[PDB]
Amino acid sequence: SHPVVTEVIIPTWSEVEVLMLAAAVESNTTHPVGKAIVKAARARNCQTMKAEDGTFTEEPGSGAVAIVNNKRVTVGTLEWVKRHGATGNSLLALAAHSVVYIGVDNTLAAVIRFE
Ligand SMILES: [N+]
């Protein structure tokens, strides 16, 4: 019903950094999963990372991407983040079992689980 971030799994970026990078991509989304990332990532005490103007790109049902502080940050299916250059990690998927995957440049950075 109401998606909430429950777990951030990391295989370098911390759990909170992954949330903040993904939220920068997802900042203006109306999609409930993206809004859940944004909510979880709010940090009133931090200099908010922002996507570069005009770089947000999305293919509905597959994922989104933007440049955040000079990094290509992807948020979406495993196929989406691999297509954008991340190398796979079978353990990350197994550790996770909705879910989204996070790529940062050529790195598969994280998986986020929602309940
Ligand atoms: N970061």
Helix content: 25-40%
Strand order of the largest sheet: 1-6-5-4-3-2
**Alpha-carbon distance between the two ends:** 9 Å
Distinct small molecules: ammonium ion
Overall structural class, as computed from helix and strand content, comes to: alpha+beta
The major β-sheet equals: 6 strands, antiparallel
**Structure summary, number of beta strands:** 6
Net shape: globular
Protein name: Copper-transporting ATPase PAA1, chloroplastic
Subcellular location: Plastid, Chloroplast membrane
Family: Belongs to the cation transport ATPase (P-type) (TC 3.A.3) family. Type IB subfamily.
PDB class: hydrolase
Question: Top keywords for this entry?
Answer:
hydrolase, binds ammonium ion, 6 strands, monomer, alpha+beta, six-stranded antiparallel beta sheet, 115 residues, Copper-transporting ATPase PAA1, chloroplastic
What topology does this entry show?
Elements: E1 5-9, H1 15-26, H2 32-41, E2 57-59, E3 63-68, E4 71-76, H3 78-83, H4 90-96, E5 99-104, E6 107-114
Antiparallel strand pairs: 1-6, 2-3, 3-4, 4-5, 5-6
Helix pairs in contact: 1-2
The structure holds ammonium ion.
PDB class: hydrolase
Keywords: P-type ATPase, copper transporter, chloroplast, inner membrane, hydrolase, membrane protein
Assembly: monomeric
How would you portray this structure in words?
Helix 1 packs across helix 2. This protein has 115 residues and is α+β, with helices and mostly antiparallel strands. It starts with a strand and ends with a strand. The chain is globular and about 35 Å long. It has one domain (1-115). It has a 6-stranded antiparallel β-sheet with strand order 1-6-5-4-3-2, with helices on both faces. It has 4 helices and 6 strands. The structure holds ammonium ion. It is found in: Plastid, Chloroplast membrane. Belongs to the cation transport ATPase (P-type) (TC 3.A.3) family. Type IB subfamily. This is Copper-transporting ATPase PAA1, chloroplastic.
